[PDB]
UniProtKB/Swiss-Prot annotation, chains A, B:
Record note on quaternary structure: 3CL-PRO exists as monomer and homodimer. Only the homodimer shows catalytic activity. Interacts with host FBXO22; this interaction promotes the proteasomal degradation of nsp5.
Domain of life (superkingdom): Viruses
Catalyzed reaction equations: TSAVLQ-|-SGFRK-NH2 and SGVTFQ-|-GKFKK the two peptides corresponding to the two self-cleavage sites of the SARS 3C-like proteinase are the two most reactive peptide substrates. The enzyme exhibits a strong preference for substrates containing Gln at P1 position and Leu at P2 position
Catalytic site: 41 (for 3cl-pro activity), 145 (nucleophile)
Subcellular localization(s) per the UniProt record: Host cytoplasm; Host Golgi apparatus; Host nucleus
Regulation: Inhibited by pyridone-containing alpha-ketoamides compounds 13a and 13b. In turn, alpha-ketoamide 13b (tert-butyl (1-((S)-1-(((S)-4-(benzylamino)-3,4-dioxo-1-((S)-2-oxopyrrolidin-3-yl)butan-2-yl)amino)-3-cyclopropyl-1-oxopropan-2-yl)-2-oxo-1,2-dihydropyridin-3-yl)carbamate) inhibits SARS-CoV-2 replication in human lung cells. Inhibited ex vivo by michael acceptor inhibitor N3. Inhibited ex vivo by compound 11a and 11b.
Protein name: 3C-like proteinase nsp5
Chain residue numbers at which the record places covalent cross-link Glycyl lysine isopeptide (Lys-Gly) (interchain with G-Cter in ubiquitin): 5, 90
Role noted for this protein: Cleaves the C-terminus of replicase polyprotein at 11 sites. Recognizes substrates containing the core sequence [ILMVF]-Q-|-[SGACN]. Cleaves and inactivates human TRMT1, preventing tRNA guanine(26)-dimethylation of tRNAs. May cleave human NLRP1 in lung epithelial cells, thereby activating the NLRP1 inflammasome pathway. May cleave human GSDMD, triggering alternative GSDME-mediated epithelial cell death upon activation of the NLRP1 inflammasome, which may enhance the release interleukins 1B, 6, 16 and 18. Also able to bind an ADP-ribose-1''-phosphate (ADRP).
Cytoplasmic side stretches: 1-306
Domain Peptidase C30: 1-306
Organism: Severe acute respiratory syndrome coronavirus 2
């Protein structure tokens, strides 16, 4: 029994984290084969950041301007290119600990593990959701940039996020490993508003299913609802619209528990309208939305890796 | 900067997890040097479990009764001993991936990362507290036993927990790596009651400090209190007494924020009595108690590992 914010095991990613330094800026890089990936803003000074011309700043850089340290081993940079907002430093050594990996672009609502690093060394691991507004509510400090988010399938690491910046609101933004930001953000120190953050409805439902599996059934009610009637109530409480695709993905959990998706939707409707009356679900007084349907299945069925 | 249930990186522990099989039972073992540690109840059948005489059950066992698999590599058992409730299988091979480690017995309140495993293979990693009643509110399924809890200092893994059993209440119990149960529990299938669980006061305070660091200052009040006056209020809300040792360990955070421990205590007093008025601290509507003072320092200062 029990249910936790459970992260993927970090071992495979630990062995890819390096320190990258340029000028006075030190952040993290991801070392896969003979390439180190890191945020390109590492080449910028404080003043460059206000309006950086990256094409120009990079032409003015040479390989020796980049210091890459893997543990107590200096990696020599022998090449550099830029892909969107990621810097690719070609190094003299293929990472012996390179795992099987893919670069994946995730959708809002999907979750991943983050290996928060400083100076190429891991500080911790935690589970995360890509928020609907394309931010993530991470735990990152100065120098966290280059830290990556990932999922694991079997033995294959699917890298989906690289951390680039913190916004004034204290939430975080970054790119896929091709250097394309998630959301309407740029690696420039210019005012940038997060879109309004909404609650990931399908994930709340998934977590309610988790709660049922673990006993909690008090929120189950006698009501039912149509999909559209639900979404009308949801929108009023800043909940993402629930699509048919979402309903379909919840199918496995609806089958496991025997509770139909729209029935669970009704249970949520009431919770939104009335509240919880000081009661808690899976130890939480708030409706948790950082667990996907698949995440519940994985934790409740005991899926392992490598 | 944000705040998350953040686990230690699992890499070092991943490389120590093996599968151990005996009779009708498969669970997990921890492979350090030429020894594999696992719960001794692996030698029991269903019938043995009702009233096991372990000294006698083990005398009747031979090395060949124990099948240890590290991936697709069979480890040959060449010896067996019992230390309290842990079985130590001596094998023909020292684990090449043995990290620097200690075996530590933690105190109630203290936290650790758990690497949940099935069949010697990791499913995930999550942060945990040793509850005051010596249970842990884990996420474990059938076959999780042998899974370990740990902290890391620099490069040294301090193993503090091995999972042995789930109790009727759905919470978990186990031993230090010397095989001594935490709490009044035994590795017998006989009814066993968890003591009443209390809230880990020192940890709630630590987490309030974390909240200050991340902005939230609304719960700060002008009032102060003596230690005893605080504990009188605490006991009424099922909070662990706050000791002077607790005050001392909160020292770093009190220094960092400039808020005195007893001042923070007063702020907590009010929160306990009046509630939050539907407000939230670090995204939570409940007072969180599974973060130690050190855990907050590590997350908020960016402490890394190896
Ligand atoms: K219902």
């Amino acid at each position: 029994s029990g249910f936790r914010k459970m992260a993927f095991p970090s071992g495979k990613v630990e062995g890819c984290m390096v320190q990258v330094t340029c000028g006075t800026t030190t952040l993290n890089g991801l070392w896969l084969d003979d390439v180190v990936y890191c945020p390109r803003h590492v080449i910028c000074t404080s003043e460059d950041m206000l309006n950086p011309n990256y094409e120009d700043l990079l032409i003015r850089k040479s390989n020796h301007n980049f210091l890459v340290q893997a543990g107590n081993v200096q990696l020599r940079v022998i090449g550099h290119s830029m892909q969107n907002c990621v810097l690719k430093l070609k190094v003299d050594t293929a990472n012996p600990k390179t795992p099987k990996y893919k670069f994946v672009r995730i959708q809002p609502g999907q979750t991943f593990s983050v290996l928060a690093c400083y100076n190429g060394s891991p500080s911790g691991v935690y589970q995360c959701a890509m928020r609907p507004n394309f931010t993530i509510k991470g735990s990152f400090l100065n120098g966290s940039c280059g830290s990556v988010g990932f999922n694991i399938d079997y033995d294959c690491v699917s890298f989906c996020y690289m951390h680039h910046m913190e916004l004034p609101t204290g939430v975080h933004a970054g790119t896929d490993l091709e250097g394309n930001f998630y959301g309407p953000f740029v690696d420039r120190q210019t005012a940038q508003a997060a879109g309004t953050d909404t609650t990931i409805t399908v994930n709340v439902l998934a977590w309610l299913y988790a709660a049922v599996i673990n006993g909690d059934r008090w929120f189950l009610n006698r009501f039912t609802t149509t999909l559209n009637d639900f979404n009308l109530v949801a929108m009023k409480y800043n909940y993402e619209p629930l699509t048919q695709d979402h309903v379909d993905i919840l199918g496995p959990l609806s089958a496991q528990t025997g509770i139909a998706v729209l029935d669970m939707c009704a249970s949520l409707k009431e919770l939104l309208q009335n509240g919880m009356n000081g009661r808690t679900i899976l130890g939480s007084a708030l409706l948790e939305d950082e667990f996907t349907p698949f995440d519940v299945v994985r934790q409740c069925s005991g899926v392992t890796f490598q």
